[PDB]
Design a protein around this ligand. Structure first.
Ligand SMILES: NC(=[NH2+])NCCC[C@@H](C=O)NC(=O)CN1CCC[C@H](NS(=O)(=O)Cc2ccccc2)C1=O
Ligand SMILES: *[C@@H]1O[C@H](CO)[C@@H](O)[C@H](O)[C@H]1NC(C)=O
Lengths: 30, 252, 8
């Protein structure tokens, strides 16, 4: 949305690595 | 940030530090939206009741930082501002309604493992994620306690709270351009933004396309991490059209 | 607050 390569982090999404608490977020969306 | 944790390197690549040239001091947080545009809270620049009114030459933007005070030698990039745009209907006289501003950089910043733009929400991303109970993430170098400073970027994950609950926790008149977030006295989990975090981003990770979306701007609160009190944030999607307008009409 | 290079 606000960019193109927007919101995909070089050190996490782009390498398919997850940060330490992002699952907490994802588990809250039901 | 109160009751948060140290961020991991490269965790919030769109996090920007608003820095005053003299005295050299941390003014507020902000976020990178493209290679030339930064989004922050209007009250970081203009707050007349406190004789606050910064101009483009008063500040610097610092991108790709982790350490609060250190000059991050070949990691961070420092930019000068070309122009500041405050929402025309920013209400500093009463409730900080429409607390938003755009800053255009003199020159585009180059992306790296530590510098990358966040996405702006579309009506549909807004509609499925801005729901009470859903958690967002707030980041900043602000105060650790109401009444000290972190040495590194701090992060906290907070649930969006139902509007009525937001309304009933304060005497300030709440508008459609705001949302509140935090834990309820009973959830027995806590955390909040605090002085120094203003203008930083409230983000959510789309379960649809796994991209990070900026849903709010740290705006205001009463004290920090007070039981039965909640942090309030500018509603980015509701002001998106003004965002598009200035970019289109003025830059990029 | 560590100093920023003067070019800035
Ligand atoms: N999440 C929190 N508990 N607080 C975040 C506070 C962030 C902080 C900047 O970093 N923002 C401000 O100080 C914005 N601001 C401006 C003046 C004082 C005000 N706090 S206050 O308790 O007076 C309530 C108030 C009064 C007028 C308009 C909005 C809210 C207020 O919150
Ligand atoms: C804010 O500063 C600019 C010039 O520096 C001007 O628009 C205005 O009069 C100043 N004061 C207020 C209240 O905005």
């Amino acid at each position: 949305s606000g960019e193109a390569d927007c919101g995909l982090r070089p050190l996490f999404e782009k390498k398919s690595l997850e940060d330490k608490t992002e699952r907490e977020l994802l588990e809250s969306y039901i | 940030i109160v009751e948060g944790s140290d961020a991991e390197i490269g965790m919030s690549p769109w996090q920007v530090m608003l820095f005053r040239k003299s005295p050299q001091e941390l003014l507020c947080g902000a976020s990178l939206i493209s290679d030339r545009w930064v989004l922050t809270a209007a009250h970081c620049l203009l707050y007349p009741p406190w004789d606050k009114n910064f101009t483009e030459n008063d500040l610097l933007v610092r991108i790709g930082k982790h350490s609060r005070t250190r000059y991050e030698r070949n990691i961070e990039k420092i930019s000068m501002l070309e122009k500041i745009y405050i929402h025309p209907r920013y209400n500093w006289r009463e409730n900080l309604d429409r607390d938003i501003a755009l800053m255009k950089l003199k020159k585009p910043v180059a992306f790296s493992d530590y510098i990358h733009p966040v996405c702006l929400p579309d009506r549909e991303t807004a509609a499925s994620l801005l729901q009470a109970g859903y958690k967002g993430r707030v980041t900043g170098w602000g105060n650790l306690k109401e009444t000290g400073q972190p040495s590194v970027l701090q992060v906290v994950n907070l649930p969006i709270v139902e509007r009525p609950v937001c309304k009933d926790s304060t005497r300030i008149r709440i508008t459609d351009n705001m949302f509140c977030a935090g834990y309820k006295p009973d959830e027995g989990k806590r955390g909040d933004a605090c002085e120094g975090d203003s203008g930083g981003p409230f983000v959510m990770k789309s379960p649809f396309n796994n991209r990070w979306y900026q849903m709010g701007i740290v705006s205001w609160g009463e004290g920090c991490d007070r039981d039965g009190k909640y942090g309030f944030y500018t509603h980015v999607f509701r002001l998106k059209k003004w965002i598009q307008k200035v970019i289109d009409q003025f830059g990029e | 607050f560590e100093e920023i290079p003067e070019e800035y």
